[PDB]
């Protein structure tokens, strides 16, 4: 689980 | 269709007594914490001095590798104990004290949950901590205290072995979350109520935890706006208390009948920190 944004 | 008073009654009647809480920057800005997404004039200036192109670059590895000074400018501001919890923190502490808190999941890195007295065993600091740091070149780890003097002196901390920049264990975009995040696997199916306070629910995988509770579980959002999965895919037992987060929390405290216990908790913990 990797931190992400915008999707 | 549930109301805020319905949720307060579920708690008073102990029909809900295993509460999972998710929080974001919205619960820390009443404490004076600079929200990095909406910086104040002083912080904005200091960051602009080192050509921060946009707020999210503070937590991006390519930018950090090129120019770590904006991050360490922000890090200096978040020294442990330079801020005081606010009413939202103490409400969550009261939730714990009353035996209702299953777990508190936070995106914040100010450490104010711990300062308010919520035990570490009840907390998941999902986007990392300043308590440890890792060399960006050789991956050696260090206790966070090893870089604190440098950070407070406006120096970029460098690895004693390879001289690479040492980075606190804050989860940047593209990095793994800490293993403690995996407490969600058991916590969220066990929750009988989900509280969301002061977050935009735009960072993943944190935001998708809102969909991890069972569909019988009410999801109570205390926030300026209906956001994220709560907006995109509402469930029938969702409740939204839209407005200032502190006022929302205070309304819930009043419906619970916890106003005096709150007042007493605040005076007692304000006495601890003064
Ligand atoms: Zn190194």
TrEMBL record, chain A:
GO terms for MF: DNA binding; structural constituent of chromatin
Positions of modified residues (N6,N6-dimethyllysine): 3
Full-protein positions shown: 8 to 14 of 27
Upper lineage: Eukaryota, Metazoa, Chordata, Craniata, Vertebrata
Name used for this protein in its record: Gene for histone H3 (germline gene)
GO annotations of cellular component type: nucleosome
